[PDB]
């Protein structure tokens, strides 16, 4: 528009394949009304029922490995092998007066750190006072 | 670049999914060069500028002349 | 002094995190309050 | 009791390295000297902030206003001055009218900076050096008289220590990235075993 | 001091266990740590080194000393390709640290790889970088000789950093090489781009004047007086 | 405006609560009867 | 009892003994947590965002100011950033508050005839001892003003 | 080439910039951003003002809670080692809880049941039955002090974080530390409970925060924009959505994803000590540098800047605010803070919309993070 | 918990097995851990009783039997199989 109302003269992708600018941009910025909608009630239902019955199997876990005999008061075997064999799994009765686990003891582990993914860190751009 | 200035083929293997570089020895081997030798000059240049009651007692002193 | 120092870090509850409890039953941890109240809602 | 001059020379040393709230420390350095007088000679003489200069014809003014305004009140009339109070005395006054041994000993604990047991430290590094060096130079002159003893190994503290030549400890391989390694792989582990039979044989 | 090889391991037994100790007790010493990975370089025993920069990454993977000391210990010992994920790999966790930008394009441009150095310099550019970055994409592109390529960079520059210095830096490069028609069209450009721009407020009222103020001495230079005369004109309409 | 009397205002009520207002033993949630 | 005693001797002791907080570790757990807490604010607030070394300083600089506090020597550090001073005296108000209330509700314990340990009695002397030469320095100066 | 584009479309001359410039998508020129930035308006909210000022905390107000149920009374947890029950109506005092020896650093009551959580600086967390006034569980195995606790909104768990930068969950019954979250890199600040996965999200001095999947034991993500400490977070009472802060940096996120929804005007407010979203989309941040900021929560606008006033014989530094809530209703604030006091701020009922429009909507674009 | 890694060889040819489960029953002969011992016959009569000597994530680290360490595909022992490849 501008330029027109001037007389005319007389005279590769590998790179940091992981860091990407859609994580960098806020979302809502260009719609202030985009909804983020509260889940409903199925799906706090479905996964509260599936996270009590797991934290209520560690509960159990806990109790009834531990020593007191009162623990199991409040506690709320076929596999197939190499696809031929069928096996028959038991777990005789321990003797009562041995030790419960023999295999355990208090052993100090250092655990490995394996991540196969980098996550990006994701910020943007007088000393005598400080 | 400065210093880079003054003295002067890419396939994936299909078996590894890896990327292969075909650069020159002569290159791969100055630059690991000038990396020994630039850290041979600075580590050399501290050293004579360290040369100029006890060692760390007069270096908190100089620090406090430095905060003056 | 050099024994005598600072705590720069915390040690993380993660390095007890990485290996199994061994049983001892503590006072503190045997059943008390066995019972959640709840509300009248 | 008078104070020497190599006496206020050994306070003033002594309060470099100690400050003006450690008077006991100072005072095992001067024999004949109390922390109680230590304290006094350096607040009433020798620390530096003190204004013994002469006064200003205003500074008598003011002195003989405040000796009237605040009778015999002398650290108080002082306080005001900023000056020491027995040179406010002197001046209302003045307008009305072998030990070697001892230096020795305070050079001595004044450069000393380890400590006791950090010097017990270093004698125990030594002598713990000195034993292994021992171990060392036994075993090259059994192995120049022919019969090859092998190094000791250091003792396990507890059960489960280590020896950190038998294995990388915690090996932290490098993730493996998009470019392939195999080349400069295999010609660092010539590099690597160039080198131990280099030191094997020129040591 | 060493003449045997079962000498250099009582040696090396004796300062791994004295580094791992201090390093158990106080693992955030990150000098220590560096000092130990020299160790073992000074043993030329690569893995027992990468596996020491590994762990102190671990410790800490935002410290940039850390991170520099690692890429050139490989590069110092030619081994470039480890140098080249590990790099690849330090911009991917720390992006907008412009030090491991530089360390990636130096070495790749000293190795001459001209193609993935403009590479690198495409993927920092897209992802909003201050105008240092910008500024070195044109100065690659320049001492390659690549000119188009600097007039690409230069109208993806206006659009990442769209202040009028931006815009004045590209009518400076077109001119000073002396391609006139270029130069006129990029300066028209950005007297079209601030008008139909106005109301979104994004430059000064004395920034567009010295826009319209050099394009206008620019055309007078180039003797037209009439364009430049009336250029005024229809700004003085446009911005009262 | 602003005085010695109000350093808030007149318009901010400043309280002093030194003692509690119920016996301690008084439940906080009250118990369910049904 | 012997359950635990004999699982000691076949498991082995826990590696993980986490000690509580018994009167014999207040003080000391307390310092700890408020050196965090000023380290915490400092490290933010600092526009630089450099740690290793500058935090062992600052740390110093608040003991230092805690000497001051209890001897009634003012705590005045030439060139000290005007925020960071601001930080240091503000958890030394907040330890000052507590030392003082520590020494108000031992006072009453030990007049009551209330247990009290042998060595809180002259704790107690001491920190009461202070807060009455502190008083009478504020009334000798007020005096003066 | 933009050139010979630029001479054709001025011949067929005889917004503009989508036109004559090329991206792949039309948000990548940050000119586009900037104009569908600037035509939105923020909505107005009123302006809040000083209500009542409460005394009665010997040491500063560490932790505030509102009653979840009712709305009748708060609970204030203090570095004098105290908790004090508010009369939300008159701010009369209700009732002392001493059962701590250092700092209670956070209070939570439970929604389903009767029940007052509290964490200290002496390692312990401790369950309150309210129907009596006292103590009736501890929870033991935090190596260092305990900083933050959270109900789960569902389940008979809670969540409890501190300097030993794990998250421990507990069952509230048998008092097993059922699971331990481990991921952080140093100290946790803040822990908030969620209905569905991620039902954990906290934050920490590793500058992240991170989205839990408690059965995996495992992040869901983890959110890496903040540069410090991020000291401060809140849930909205009524969308997915969760708040956070730095120094000079609060941001908004998208639970059901971990997407950053909304960059705040945050710009030279100092450290955030604490955040509280209102159920109006106001989102409060509380500076240590005392000064109250009020954000409309969709926009990101800040809408009022109000300066603490201490209490007369405070030092300057006592200005800072500590903790906050809304109460239910959400017409009230209650504030903690370091001269030792508790205010009450409640928004102007006397404005309007031209009568007091506040801080004027303008998104400076020096600031590129909008 | 991954189930045993056990080889048909060392199962035998009878079509059932009953297996003894034991949770922390032993510690493993590599990585000295405890774990959840497997033991079996290969018939009622048999007076050999077979043991898993090592756990689960050692075995599949090796690709190898729990009760006898040879290759759990090829049924051949580390060092023959490392030299092989
Ligand atoms: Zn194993
Ligand atoms: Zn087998």
Redesign the pocket.
């Known amino acids: 528009m501008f330029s027109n109302r001037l007389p005319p003269p007389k005279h590769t992708d590998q790179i940091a394949k992981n860091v990407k600018l859609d994580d960098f941009i806020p979302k809502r910025q260009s719609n202030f009304e985009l909804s983020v909608p509260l889940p409903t009630k199925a799906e706090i239902q479905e996964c509260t029922a599936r996270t009590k019955s797991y934290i209520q199997r560690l509960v159990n876990a806990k109790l009834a490995n531990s020593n007191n005999r009162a623990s199991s008061r409040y506690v709320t075997a076929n596999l197939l092998l190499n696809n031929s064999h069928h096996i028959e799994v038991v777990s005789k009765q321990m003797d009562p007066l041995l030790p419960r686990f023999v295999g355990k003891k208090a052993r100090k582990v250092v655990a490995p750190t394996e991540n196969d993914e980098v996550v990006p860190v994701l910020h943007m751009d007088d000393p005598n006072e400080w | 670049l400065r210093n880079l200035a003054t003295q002067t083929k890419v396939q994936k293997d299909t078996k590894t999914g890896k990327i292969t570089i075909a650069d020159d020895d002569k290159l791969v081997n100055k630059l690991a060069v000038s990396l020994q030798s630039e850290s041979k000059k600075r580590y050399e240049a501290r050293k004579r500028q360290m040369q100029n009651i006890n060692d760390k007692n007069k270096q908190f002193n100089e620090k406090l002349s430095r905060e003056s | 002094t050099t024994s005598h120092r600072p705590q720069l870090e915390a040690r993380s509850g993660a390095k007890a995190a990485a290996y199994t409890p061994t049983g001892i039953e503590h006072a503190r941890l045997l059943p008390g309050h066995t019972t959640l109240k709840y509300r009248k809602f | 009791g008078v104070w020497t001059n190599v006496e206020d020379q050994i306070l003033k040393a002594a309060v470099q390295k100690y400050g003006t709230h450690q008077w006991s420390k100072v005072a095992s350095l001067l024999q004949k000297k109390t922390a109680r007088q230590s304290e006094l000679r350096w607040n009433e003489y020798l620390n530096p902030k003190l204004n013994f200069t002469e006064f200003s014809k205003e500074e008598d003014a003011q002195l003989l206003d405040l000796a009237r305004e605040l009778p015999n009140q002398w650290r108080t009339i002082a306080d005001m001055m900023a000056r020491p109070a027995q040179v406010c005395v002197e001046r209302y006054n003045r307008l009305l009218e072998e030990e070697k041994e001892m230096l020795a000993e305070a050079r001595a604990r004044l450069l000393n900076t380890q400590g006791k047991k950090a010097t017990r430290k270093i004698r125990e590094r030594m002598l713990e050096e000195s034993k292994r060096i021992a171990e060392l130079q036994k075993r090259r002159e059994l192995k120049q008289a022919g019969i090859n003893v092998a190094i000791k190994k250091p003792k396990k503290k507890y059960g489960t220590d280590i020896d950190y030549n038998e294995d990388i400890v915690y090996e932290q391989a490098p993730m493996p990235g998009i470019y392939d390694t195999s080349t400069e792989d295999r010609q660092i582990k010539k590099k690597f075993e160039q080198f131990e039979r280099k030191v094997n044989r020129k040591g | 001091d060493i003449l045997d090889l079962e000498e250099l391991r009582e040696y090396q037994r004796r300062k791994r266990t004295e580094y791992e100790g201090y390093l158990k007790r106080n693992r955030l010493d990150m000098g220590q740590w560096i000092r130990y990975a020299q160790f073992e370089i000074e043993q030329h025993d690569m893995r027992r080194a990468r596996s020491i920069f590994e762990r102190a990454l671990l410790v800490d993977s935002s410290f940039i000393p850390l991170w520099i000391r690692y890429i050139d210990a490989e590069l110092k010992v030619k081994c470039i390709n480890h140098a080249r994920n590990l790099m690849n790999r330090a911009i991917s966790t720390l992006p907008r640290v412009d030090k491991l930008w530089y360390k990636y394009l130096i070495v790749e441009e000293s190795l001459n790889n001209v193609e993935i150095v403009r590479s690198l310099y495409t993927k920092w550019c897209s992802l909003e970088p201050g105008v240092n970055a910008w500024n070195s994409f044109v100065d690659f592109e320049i001492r390659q000789k690549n000119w188009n390529g600097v007039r690409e960079i230069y109208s993806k520059y206006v659009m990442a950093h769209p202040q009028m210095q931006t815009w004045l830096k590209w009518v400076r490069f077109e001119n000073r090489h002396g391609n006139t028609e270029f130069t006129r069209s990029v300066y028209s450009l950005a007297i079209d781009t601030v008008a139909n721009l106005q109301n979104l407020q994004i430059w000064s009222d004395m920034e567009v004047a010295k826009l319209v103020n050099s394009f206008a001495h620019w055309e007078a230079a180039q003797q037209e007086y009439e364009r430049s005369s009336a250029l005024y004109q229809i700004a003085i309409e446009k911005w009262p | 405006g602003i005085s010695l009397e109000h350093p808030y205002g007149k318009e901010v009520e400043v309280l002093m609560e030194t003692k509690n207002t119920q016996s301690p033993q008084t439940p906080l949630v009250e118990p369910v009867t049904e | 009892y012997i359950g635990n005693l004999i699982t000691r001797q076949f498991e082995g002791r826990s590696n993980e003994i986490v000690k509580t907080t018994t009167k014999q570790r207040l003080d000391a757990y307390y310092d700890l947590e408020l050196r965090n807490s000023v380290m915490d604010d400092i490290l933010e607030m600092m526009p630089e965002s450099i740690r290793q070394k500058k935090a062992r300083t600052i740390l110093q600089h608040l003991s230092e100011a805690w000497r001051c506090w209890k001897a009634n020597i003012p705590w005045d550090v030439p060139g000290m950033p005007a925020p960071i001073k601001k930080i240091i005296e503000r958890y030394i108000k907040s330890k000052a508050d507590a030392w003082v209330s520590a020494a108000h509700y031992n006072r009453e314990r030990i007049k009551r005839g209330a247990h009290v340990e042998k060595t809180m009695v002259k704790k107690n002397l001491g920190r009461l001892t202070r807060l009455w030469i502190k008083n009478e320095q504020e009334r000798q100066r007020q005096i003066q003003k | 080439s933009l050139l010979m584009r630029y001479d054709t479309y001025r011949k067929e001359s005889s917004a503009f910039v989508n036109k004559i410039f090329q991206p792949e998508v039309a948000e990548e020129l940050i000119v586009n951003r900037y104009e569908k930035l600037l035509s939105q308006r923020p909505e107005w909210h009123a302006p809040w003002k000083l209500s009542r000022v409460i005394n009665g905390h010997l040491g500063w107000v560490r932790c505030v809670a509102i009653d979840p149920v009712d709305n009748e009374w708060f609970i204030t947890g203090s570095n004098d080692t105290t908790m004090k029950v508010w009369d939300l109506a008159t701010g009369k005092l209700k009732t002392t809880l001493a059962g701590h020896v250092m700092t209670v650093r956070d209070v939570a009551v439970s929604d389903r049941h009767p029940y007052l959580f509290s964490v200290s600086e002496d390692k312990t967390v401790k369950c309150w039955d309210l129907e009596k006034n006292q103590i009736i569980r501890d929870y033991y195995g935090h190596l260092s002090g305990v900083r933050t606790v959270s109900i789960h909104p569902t389940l008979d768990l809670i969540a409890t974080a501190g300097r030993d930068s794990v998250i421990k969950l507990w069952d509230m019954r048998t008092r097993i530390p059922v699971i331990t979250l481990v991921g952080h890199k140093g100290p946790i600040n803040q822990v908030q409970c969620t209905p569905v996965d991620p039902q954990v999200v906290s934050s920490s001095t590793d500058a992240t925060v991170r989205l839990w999947d408690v059965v995996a034991g495992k992040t869901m993500k983890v959110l890496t924009h903040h540069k410090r400490s991020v000291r401060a977070t809140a849930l909205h009472p009524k969308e997915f959505s969760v708040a956070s802060a730095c120094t000079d940096d609060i941001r908004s996120w998208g639970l059901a994803e971990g997407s950053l929804l909304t960059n705040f005007e945050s710009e030279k407010t100092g450290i955030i000590n604490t955040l509280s979203i209102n159920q109006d989309d106001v989102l409060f941040a509380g500076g240590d540098n005392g000064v109250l900021s009020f954000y409309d929560y969709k926009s990101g606008h800040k809408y009022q800047s109000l300066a603490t006033r201490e209490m007369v014989g405070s030092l300057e530094g006592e200005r800072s605010v500590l903790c906050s809530t809304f109460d239910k209703t959400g017409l009230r604030l209650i504030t903690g803070e370091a001269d030792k006091s508790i205010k009450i701020w409640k928004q102007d009922e006397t404005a309007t919309k031209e009568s007091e429009p506040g801080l004027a909507w303008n998104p400076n674009l020096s600031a590129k993070r909008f | 918990e991954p189930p045993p890694n ?2 048909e ?2 199962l035998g040819d009878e079509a059932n097995i009953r297996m003894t489960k034991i949770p922390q029953g032993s510690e493993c002969k590599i990585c000295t851990l405890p774990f959840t011992l497997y033991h079996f016959k290969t018939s009622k009569r048999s007076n050999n009783i077979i043991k898993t000597l090592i756990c689960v994530r050692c075995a599949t680290q090796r690709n190898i ?1 729990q ?2 360490m ?1 290759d759990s595909r090829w049924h051949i022992p580390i060092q023959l199989r490392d030299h092989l490849i």
């Open positions: 056990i080889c060889q060392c039997c009760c006898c040879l």
